[model samples]
Target chain A: SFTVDSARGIFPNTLTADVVPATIARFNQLNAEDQLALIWFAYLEMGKTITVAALGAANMQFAEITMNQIRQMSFQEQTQVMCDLANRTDTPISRAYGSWTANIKLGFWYQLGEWMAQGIVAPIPSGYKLSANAASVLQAIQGLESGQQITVLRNCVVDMGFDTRVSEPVVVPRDMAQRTQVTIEGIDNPTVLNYMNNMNANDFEVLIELFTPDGALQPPFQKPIVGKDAVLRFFREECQNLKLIPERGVTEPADGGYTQIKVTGKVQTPWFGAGVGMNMAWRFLLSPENKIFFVAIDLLASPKELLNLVR
Target chain B: SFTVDSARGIFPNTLTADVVPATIARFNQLNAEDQLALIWFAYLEMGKTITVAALGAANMQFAEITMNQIRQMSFQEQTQVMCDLANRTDTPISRAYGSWTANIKLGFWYQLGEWMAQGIVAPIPSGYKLSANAASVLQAIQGLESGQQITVLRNCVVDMGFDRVSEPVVVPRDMAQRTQVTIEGIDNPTVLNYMNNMNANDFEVLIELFTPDGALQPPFQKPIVGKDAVLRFFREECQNLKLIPERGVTEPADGGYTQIKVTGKVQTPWFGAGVGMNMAWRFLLSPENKIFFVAIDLLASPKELLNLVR
Candidate 1:
C-alpha cells in the first residue's frame, strides 16, 4: 500500500507539468498589490497542504522542516500564509492538494515575507478593486492566532458561503498509530459548509444523514426518537451547547505537533450584552499537513453585561 | 404564469409520479420492520415537499370543509400510511416526493402535539418515523400560522439523494415600500457576520472579488494589507473553520425573501486546542439580480460541553 511518503513523488510527477509552471506563473503575476489577494485564494485553495504540514511537523519529518523554523518566520508572513492556505474557496476537495501545497513548495510565502522585509508598503484601498471575499479574509486574519481551530471555522464558514450541506468534524476514536491529529474529510469543511450555508437555506437537512440512526443510537436521555427531528433536537440540545467562546485547553501539551500553541480573544457584542462576546482562538500544529482542521467558538461575553443590555 | 400559487398543485402532480404508489406497493410487500426501512428510503429518495395545507385551501376554497379539516385528515392518513411506507431500502430524490411531503406536512407537529395530545381517544406518539427532509418541513410548518401562504419547495437542485435540504417560507415584501417590521433584502445580522467570517476564512476568496485593489484587512489587526492578502486571510480562516450551517426564508405574498434564520457550527482545532466548541448562524436575501446576506449565533453553550455532549 502506498503511504503519503510513497505517494509524495507520485503526485509531483503526474500533475507537476499540469500545475507547476502555471502555479509559479500565477505567483509571479500578482501585482505587488494583487499578490496579497492571491495569498487568500492560495490558502483557501491549499489548506489541505496545511493539514499535512500540521501532521508533518508534529510527527515525522515530511520535508525536513522543523516546527521551530516555522515559528521563526515573521508574524505577518506566518499568519498571512496560514490564513491564505486555510481560507480556500469552494472547489472539489481534490483542488486543495495543489492550491495549498504549491504555496509553501513554490515560495509564495517567501514572496510575502520578502515584501514585508521592505518597509510599510501601500496597499489598494477599499472599493478600488478588492473583492468582498478578500475583505472578509483579511478581517479573519486580522485576529490571527486568536482562538482554537473550531472557533475560527465557526465564523469563516458562514462568511465564505453559508451552507448546511456540510457537517462539522465529529468526535471519533483516535488512531494513535496513524496521524492522530484532527482530519478534514468529505469535501473540505469550509467548502462543504460554505456550499451548505451559501446555497441551501432550507433547514440544515444534511445533518439528518450525518448522525447515527435513532433506533441504533443511545441518545443522551434515551428519548426514543425516529428521524431527523430527533437527531436535530439531540444535536442542538446536547452537542450544540458545547460551542463555548474561547474553549481553552484545560491541559498542557506533551509535544509540538499535537501540541501547537493556542491563544484566544473576545469581541463583545455589548448590544446583545457583554455576555455575548465572540470567542476565538488559534491552533498551531506542526507538519507537512499544515492545514488547521478545527476552528470553532461560542458567542460569549460577560454574562453580567448581557443582563443589562436586554430590551 | 406558473406562480408559486400554482406550485402546490404542480408539486403534487410531480410527487405523484416521483413517489409512485408502486414504491409504496413495494413496501407493502415487505415485513413490518422492512416497511419502516422503506419509508426511510423513500423519504430520502423523493425530495421532501412542504405544501402549505391552509395555503392550498385558501387559493381554492370549499363549503364547510376548511383547510384545517383537510390538513387534519391528510395528517392522519399519512401517519398510518408512513407506518406501511417505512419498509423499503434505497431510492433516488426524484422518487420519494409523495411520502416526503405526506410525512412532513403532518408528521412533524402532529407528532409533537401528539405528545401533548396523549391520553385522548386515539393518540399518536411523538417518536414517529420521518425523513430528514420531511422533518425540516414540519419544523417550518410548526413555526408558521394558518392562512399565511408558506413557500414550500422541491429541493431538486443538487442530486444529494438525502433529506438535508429544507423548504423555507418566503416572507413577502415590497422593497420600495419599506416596512420597519420586514427586512428589505437578504442582508441581515447573520448575513453580515457570515460574509465577514467567510472573508476571514477565504472559503471562496470573496475578498479578492469584493474588495478594492490593494486593500488590506488583518485577521489579528495588522498585516496582509492587499487585495491578495485579504483573500489569503479569508482563505486561511475559512480553511480552519470549515463547516457552515445556513437557512433562508421567502414570503409568498410579495414574492419577497429574507434570510430570517441561519446557524453555523464547526469542530476542528484551528490555531490550537485539543478541540473547540462550535455553532453560529447566517441569513440571506435577493435584491435585483444579486443576493446579500448576514450571520449570527444560535447555540448558547460551552466548548468543552459540546465535546462531551456532541
Candidate 2:
C-alpha cells in the first residue's frame, strides 16, 4: 500500500476560488452525517487517512492498529480535525487510534468555516517561489517538478546516504541541543488566522541552527524555508516577485481540507486576470527531529483557470 | 573563448547547423599550420581538453609535439594529464614531460577531428543532449511553467527521478541487490537495426532474473502491454513510438577501444514535449564489461542538437 509509485497521486485538488462559494453551500446543505461521510470518503480516496473503525473490525487488527493508529498516527494534534483524537487517546484502543483522523476532521471544518465566514484566500503551491539562483543546483538533484517532488525528493536527498540534515532552529537557548519538531496546521487549522501568519523568513532563520557544516538549506522553497541562510536570502531577495499582488477573499470552503479563495477582484499583477481563483489544501509529515511538520497551500490549478479567477 | 552558456546560445537557432558547416569548410582550406593554430585557438576556448598547454605556459612546451605523433599516445598515457593534476603526485615532471607532451598532441587532434565531424554531422552545438534533459527537470522544479509539481506527484506505481542515473536495476541473481552500472554496445546501430537487434520479449525474460522475490516486471510500456513488466524495460520502446519518434546516426569507424561505440537518442514523451526531453545514451566502457556497466549515451550528446544529428 505504501510503495513509491502510487504515493504520488495522493494530493487534493480543491474547488477553484470562482466556484468555491457555491461548492461550500452545497456541502453545508448536507446534514452532518453525510458531510462526515463525504469527508471520510474523500480522505480515503485521496488515500491519506486511516479510520479507527476500519482498523478495529478487520482480521488483520494488529496491522490495522499499528499502521492506522500507531505508525501513521499524529500524537501532536493539528488543531483542525473534527475529532479531538489527541485529547481522547486515554485508553489503549483509543491511544492506538492516532490523531490523524481527528485532525483530518478538524482541518476540514476549519477550511469550510473560513469559506463561510470570510472570503477564501489562495495558497501558494510549493516550489513556485524557487528563485533563478536556487533553481539550477536544486534541479540537478530534483527534476523540474521541484514543487511536486518536495516530499519525495527530500526523501531522495536524505536517501543519497550523506549526512545531509541541516542544523536545528535557534530556539530558546535552553533548547539549543534539543532537537525539536514544528507543525503547520493546514487551512482547516483554526491556528491559520491569516495568509501570512506563522511562516516567514525568521522561522527559516531559526531553522538554520540545524545545518551541518557543509549542509545547505533545501532550495526552491520560500515559506518555512530550510538551510542556514539560503531561505533568508530567498525570502529577502525573491519573495516579492511571488507575492500575490491582488487582494482576495476566501470564497467557499468545503469539508475535508478543501477551499476556494477568490481574490477581491484583481488589484494588480498582469498575470492574474481581473478575478483569480485558487483551490488549495494542506499536508502533514515528520520533521528531521521526529517532531510534526506540515504546510497548507493552493493546489496546481491551470493558468487558464487562475487567469479567469481575476477577470 | 567558450563557455557552456555562450555555447548553448550559438545553438538552438535554425541557422545553427547551416552556419557551421561552411565555416568549418573554410577553416579546412587554410594552410595546415594556420588551420592547426586556428583550431587549437578554438580549443583554447572550447576548454574541454585538460592538456599541459591549456593548463598554462608551464606545459606550453608540450604543445610543440606534432598532432600526428600526439594521436599515437595510448589512452592510459592520455588520461594521465587529468590524473597528475587531480592526484598531484611526484612523478618527476621531467620523466613525464616527453610522454605528456605527446598525449596533449593527441588530445589536440582529437578535439579538432570532433569539431570538424560535428560541423559535417549536425553542427548544432555541444552538450545539447544533457541540456534538454536538464532543462526538462529544471522547468518542473521551478513550477513557474506548470501548475502541478511533477515531482510531488505520487499517483503512479513509481517515481522516475529522470536524471543521469535511473531507477535501480535489481541484479538477476540476488534479486535484492541492485546493479547500478551497466555497459551496452550495439553494432551497425541504425534506428531500425538497433530495434531489430534486441528482442523486447527477451529483455523481459532477462529482467525476470533481476527482480526481488515477489515483484515482477512492470509491463512492456503502458499501451503495448501490462504495468508489471515495465521497470527494467529499455529506452527504445518509448522513443520509437509514432507520436514522438526520435532520430540518430553513427559517427565513424576506429580502433582505440575497437569495442567502444557511442550511440545517442532524444525524445519528448507525450506530456513532456517542451518541458523536458526523454533522452538517453549508451557507452561500451570496456570489452570485458560489455553488457555489464556502461555510461549513458544520452549524456554524451547535448540537448540543443539531439535532433540535428540526422
For candidate 1, the docking band is incorrect
TM-scores, all models, native as reference: 0.23, 0.25
Residue-level lDDT tens digits of model 1 in A1-311: 21111111111101001111112222221223343554444345333222322222211222224223445566554543343333332333213322322212233333333344543322223344433223433343343332222233322322221122212233332233532122222122332232123112222244344322322122211112344565455443234212223322221232334222232334332112233334432222212233222212222222222122111
DockQ of each: 0.02, 0.01
CAPRI category for model 2 = incorrect
**What TM-score does prediction 1 earn?**
0.23
What does the i-RMS of model 1 come to? 25.2
Tens digits of lDDT, candidate 2, A1-311: 12111111122222222112212222322222233333333322332222343223222323233333332333222211222221232344333333223222232333433432342322122223332212222333232222222222222212111121112123222233442323322223222222232232224344333333222221211123333355445433322212232222233432333332332211111112222233223222223332212222333323332333321
For model 2, residues B1-310, the per-residue Cα lDDT tens digits are: 2211111111111111111121222222222223223333343443122322222233334544433333455544433432332223345432333234322323333453564454521232343222221222223224321211221111110211111112222212233432222223334332233233232223344323321321211111111112243333443222222112243333322222112233333222223333232333222211222222122211211443243331
Model 2 segments beyond 4 Å from truth? A1-167, A171-195, A200-246, A253-295, A299-311, B1-197, B200-255, B258-281, B285-310
> What's the CA error at residue A127 for candidate 1, in Å?
5.5
